[PDB]
């Protein structure tokens, strides 16, 4: 058989591969670079624009644009370059051969799916397509049918409660805190220690400081006192040029804004209170199964100690006879792709695809008809 | 009462005087000169180093250092000489008598305030001190409680939105375009016409060509065509020695880099797009009041036509039902000092001072506790 | 094909030849001599003025003018004589046959290219022309696409950073220390030992003492102590008339002013600190590649030990995890010509030439339009 593609556009990373594989063939940043300086040498083989690992490699010459932000595609001519690179250069497969599966954050604009569909059939000429809610796929990955899923990548965070494969749309919470807003906060706070980062090519440095050094405090105000009193907590990092920077009590302050969006001036409650309020909107027969199956998903949940901090601060809210368990598998950065990889391999699914014969009759609005 | 001192270190200029005055007693460049040649005469009354109007007068013999750049104090032994000159020679007042108020650009390194505080209490022995955000003072000066303030001196530019005296820290933009980088650009571009300027003592000439001759085009590419086609725009200036230089289409190209930082190889957007993006980070109930109260502040906003160019190019971005007003008072070069002069005179403020009795208990870190 | 001429006017030397050759056909000093005495014999075949190797041969009778100083052409009626000699006498080729390529120091006056172009099309009637930045050609010569280039001839020194064939114009440093100011310093310092040299015809002697005897100390103050204490360092030279002079600790003092322009009363920093500051103006992602590819170019970099002195005194500034390499090929005096020889042979280049049909339409200002 022709296996289908699974392509988790996400934001910030593209994850792609064939259904039935256990990890993606292609993981590269969803970033398009254009050169800003004057090219002076002649015969250099100048190239209009760079995608992914190239734009990361040459980033010092480039201006880097993400075409997707908050799970919304904001520039289609970039995004189509990213798909073109994914199919032809990175997977080295012609998409006209076999179906494609795409993933989207819930509750985002209706036109985004119509444009994705129109591009997939018109330019890439895919034989059939489907789009699937990421947080649903995270359950397929973690091997469950009853869950509440905190799925948090770059761009967007959302909670979806699912009971025995019935989703509860009225209870779906979406929040726009994400790895990119922890990064922009880490930029505005590192400045306290004099370090400075003003360009995209070094926003990509701060993005990797955040990944290695940052961690989540099990209780915030005592570690704030500790690392204000003893320097033993602070750690140091070599910038690309060889300068050494040092980061102390800061390296737990940026991921803790997930629990206090007030630090960046948002009104809304952190991931713990939005998780609890999402459970509270569910009807009371299912709350015990939701409290047991809290599933972490996506990369922004990778910070050390976010599991124990969640279990603590939800147990501070839950009724004390209940039992609260946070399921944080180590693969979890890929779980949306793994779930889509198994979903697309199910023989039952093969009916679900939007085929081109349907699209040519109904137009791109068919998605709202046949998808979720 | 003992009136407090107001000392707006800024960069490039020092502005100082007593609270409740309407203009500063002391305006002199924040520049320290040391002699580089061999002194040959004997009995001359040689002097180690010169501050301010002296280093300006003798500049042909000296090397001129600015101790502050990009609003960061980089040499404390110079800076303390500048403060010493300010209190004892220029104001002719012992700072041990009465409090002092100091101004700083937002979002700059945390240690700069601690060092300023430590020097003010330890060496100058001031009874009480405070440090105040410049852009807040520009509103006190312009008589407003709701504003967005483009404050741009030597060293640094920043936007701060303020609504009814609540600042919105998440929306504070800081930019390192400034009068000094327009000056270094004017040096690298005047070379096109053969004139050359390689030393600090003539960097101080270029800094005054920029002040008199330069102006901002209401639309760039038509004046570029005009002054490429008609010489009628060009104007001439006498150097100190009596050589005449002539400057044409150049004299609008250097201040226009405020709107196209690409000319000096920065990524970031000009002052107009950073102002608009700062408004966009504010919540939508206040944007109409921010759009009405755009306040220009600081000397780098003095170029003829920068008001009309800002109002044009922000109106090009704002929704056309909104109303856009640029408030550019003629005093505006002094508005940060005028605002600090009124702030320090408020009877309500007298509680706010960091007193020495507090500092001796808490140490220099008390600033972060009691200031903003 | 008609091969193009490559004519690296430089200063002090003219280097010329055909594209695709590996060394120039013509290397002669860019010097014009006029006779100053009364000619007494009759029928001698007296000739108004001499160019190049003639003015060197007869120099005792002549006054020698360089028409180019600090990479600026200051006398066009001399310079056009030098070009006339280059094409017709030394290469023995009519320039009307095939294109010509010319080289210029960066950041020099805009009108110099317009005059060069106007003379090349109007008088020499060349079919096509181009002008190329010397420091770019030194990379073509050294076989690299990423570099920072310290190119230092007679007249002018400059640093140009180039990353993968993108130049970084904001980081281009130009400095007016050069072989001619080391020569005038060697004249003013040799007077210490009583020798004296006051005329151009013996400035051309000092220029060759500088070439043979001088060398750069790996550390200045210990060799200054050594050669003040032990005479073992001193070396002797025969003047043309047979007088022997002797030079001791002096012979390293003149080339060391490249690292301490204070010795000749300039403010600015030496070539090492200008190289480092040029790297610092570059963005932080590329600095490791700039630090690895430091390329020496031009004749003033020929002094023995300048490589090791540069590597030392840049390693004193660079972060200690970096690796610093100074690339000083033995040809390097010719590398700008070798680079222009390969550049002009590239088939891709043939579009780049300014053809006469373009010039006749746009006028001499076309250079700024179609060149770099």
């Amino acid at each position: 058989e022709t296996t289908a593609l699974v392509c988790d556009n996400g934001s910030g990373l593209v994850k792609a591969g064939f259904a039935g594989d256990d990890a993606p063939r292609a993981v590269f940043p969803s970033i398009v670079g254009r050169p800003r300086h004057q090219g002076v040498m002649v015969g250099m083989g100048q190239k209009d624009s760079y995608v992914g690992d190239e734009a990361q490699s040459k980033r010092g010459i480039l201006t880097l644009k993400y075409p997707i932000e908050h799970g919304i595609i904001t520039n289609w001519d970039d995004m189509e370059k990213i798909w073109h690179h994914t199919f032809y250069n990175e997977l080295r497969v012609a998409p006209e051969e076999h179906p494609t599966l795409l993933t989207e954050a819930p509750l985002n604009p209706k036109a985004n799916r119509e444009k994705m569909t129109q591009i997939m059939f018109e330019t890439f000429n895919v034989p059939a397509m489907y789009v699937a809610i990421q947080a649903v796929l995270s359950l397929y990955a973690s091997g469950r049918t009853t869950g509440i899923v905190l799925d948090s990548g770059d761009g967007v965070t959302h909670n979806v409660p699912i009971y025995e494969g019935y989703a509860l749309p009225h209870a779906i919470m979406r929040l726009d805190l994400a790895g990119r807003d922890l990064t922009d906060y880490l930029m505005k706070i590192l400045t306290e220690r004099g370090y400075s980062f003003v360009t995209t090519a070094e926003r990509e440095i701060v993005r990797d400081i955040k990944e290695k050094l940052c961690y989540v405090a099990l209780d915030f105000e005592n570690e704030m006192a500790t690392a204000a009193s003893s320097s033993s907590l602070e750690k140091s990092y070599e910038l690309p040029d060889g300068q050494v920077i040092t980061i102390g009590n800061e390296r737990f302050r940026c991921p803790e804004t997930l629990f206090q969006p007030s630090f960046i001036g948002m009104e809304s409650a952190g991931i713990h209170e939005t998780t609890y309020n999402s459970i509270m909107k569910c009807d009371i027969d299912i709350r015990k199964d939701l409290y047991a199956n809290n599933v972490m998903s996506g990369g922004t949940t990778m910070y050390p100690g976010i599991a124990d901090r969640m279990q603590k601060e939800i147990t501070a809210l839950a009724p004390s006879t209940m039992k609260i368990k946070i399921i944080a598998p180590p693969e979890r950065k890929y779980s949306v792709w793994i779930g889509g990889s198994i979903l697309a391999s199910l023989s039952t699914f093969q009916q679900m695809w939007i085929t081109k014969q349907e699209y040519d009759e109904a137009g791109p609005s068919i998605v709202h008809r046949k998808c979720f | 009462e003992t009136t407090a001192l107001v000392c707006d270190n800024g960069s490039g200029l020092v502005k100082a005087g007593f609270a409740g005055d309407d203009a500063p007693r002391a305006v002199f460049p924040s520049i320290v000169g040391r002699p580089r040649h061999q002194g040959v005469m004997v009995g001359m009354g040689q002097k180690d180093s010169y501050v301010g109007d002296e280093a300006q007068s003798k500049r042909g013999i000296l090397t001129l250092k600015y101790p502050i750049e990009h609003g960061i104090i980089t040499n404390w032994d110079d800076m303390e000489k500048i403060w010493h000159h300010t209190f004892y020679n220029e104001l002719r007042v012992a700072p041990e008598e009465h409090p002092t108020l100091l101004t700083e650009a937002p979002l700059n390194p945390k240690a700069n305030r601690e060092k300023m505080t430590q020097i003010m209490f330890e060496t100058f022995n001031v009874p009480a001190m405070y440090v105040a955000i410049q852009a807040v003072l520009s509103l006190y000066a312009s008589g407003r409680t709701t504003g967005i303030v483009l404050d741009s001196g030597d060293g640094v530019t920043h936007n701060v939105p303020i609504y009814e005296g609540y600042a919105l820290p998440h929306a504070i933009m800081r930019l390192d375009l400034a009068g000094r980088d327009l000056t270094d650009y004017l040096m690298k571009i005047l070379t096109e016409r053969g004139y050359s300027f390689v030393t600090t003592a003539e960097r101080e000439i270029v800094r005054d060509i920029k002040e008199k001759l330069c102006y901002v085009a209401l639309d760039f590419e038509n004046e570029m065509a005009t002054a490429a086609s008609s010489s009628s725009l060009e104007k001439s200036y006498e150097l100190p020695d009596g050589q005449v230089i002539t400057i044409g289409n150049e004299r609008f190209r250097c201040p226009e880099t405020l709107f196209q930082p690409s000319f000096i190889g920065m990524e970031s957007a000009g002052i107009h797009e950073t102002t608009y993006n700062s408004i966009m980070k504010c919540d939508i109930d206040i944007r109409k009041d921010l759009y009405a109260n755009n306040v220009m502040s600081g000397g780098t906003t003095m170029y003829p036509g920068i008001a009309d160019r800002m109002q044009k190019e922000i109106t090009a971005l704002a929704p056309s039902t909104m109303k856009i007003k640029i408030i550019a008072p003629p005093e505006r070069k002094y508005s940060v000092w005028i605002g600090g002069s009124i702030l320090a005179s408020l009877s309500t403020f007298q509680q706010m001072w960091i007193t020495k009795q507090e500092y001796d208990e808490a140490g220099p870190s008390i600033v972060h506790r009691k200031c903003f | 094909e008609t091969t193009a001429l490559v004519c690296d006017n430089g200063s002090g030397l003219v280097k010329a030849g055909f594209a695709g050759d590996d060394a120039p056909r013509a290397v002669f000093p860019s010097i014009v001599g006029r006779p100053r005495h009364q000619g007494v014999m009759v029928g001698m075949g007296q000739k108004d003025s001499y160019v190049g190797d003639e003015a060197q041969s007869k120099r005792g009778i002549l006054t020698l003018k360089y028409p180019i100083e600090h990479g600026i052409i200051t006398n066009w009626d001399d310079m056009e004589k030098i070009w006339h000699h280059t094409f017709y006498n030394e290469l023995r080729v009519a320039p009307e046959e095939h294109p010509t390529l010319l080289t210029e120091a960066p950041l020099n006056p805009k009108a110099n290219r317009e005059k060069m172009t106007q003379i090349m099309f109007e008088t020499f009637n060349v079919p096509a022309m181009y002008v190329a930045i010397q420091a770019v050609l030194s990379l073509y010569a050294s076989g690299r696409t990423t570099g920072i280039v310290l190119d230092s001839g007679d007249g002018v020194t400059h640093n140009v950073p180039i990353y993968e064939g993108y130049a970084l114009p904001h980081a281009i440093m130009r400095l007016d220390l050069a072989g001619r100011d080391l020569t005038d310093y060697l004249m003013k310092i040799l007077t210490e030992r009583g020798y004296s040299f006051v005329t151009t015809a013996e400035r051309e002697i000092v220029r060759d003492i500088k070439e043979k005897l001088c060398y750069v100390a790996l550390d200045f103050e210990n060799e200054m102590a050594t050669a003040a204490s032990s005479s073992s360092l001193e070396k002797s030279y025969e003047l043309p008339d047979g007088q022997v002079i002797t030079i001791g600790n002096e012979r390293f003092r003149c080339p060391e002013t490249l690292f301490q322009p204070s010795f000749i009363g300039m403010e600015s920093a030496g070539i090492h600190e200008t190289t480092y500051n040029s790297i610092m103006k570059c963005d932080i992602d590329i600095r490791k590649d700039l630090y690895a590819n430091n390329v020496m170019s031009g004749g003033t970099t020929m002094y023995p030990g300048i490589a090791d002195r540069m590597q030392k005194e840049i390693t004193a500034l660079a972060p200690s995890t970096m690796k610093i390499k100074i690339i000083a090929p033995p040809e390097r005096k010719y590398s700008v010509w070798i680079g222009g020889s390969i550049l002009a042979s590239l088939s891709t280049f043939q579009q780049m030439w300014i053809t006469k049909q373009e010039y006749d339409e746009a006028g001499p200002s076309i250079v700024h339009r179609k060149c770099f």
């Binding site: 004099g194 370090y195 400075s196 920077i245 | 750049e69 990009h70 980089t74 | -």
Partner: peptide, 7 residues
């Protein structure tokens, strides 16, 4: 500054 720039 201490890193991103010269101050």
């Amino acid at each position: 500054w201490x890193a991103x720039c010269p101050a």
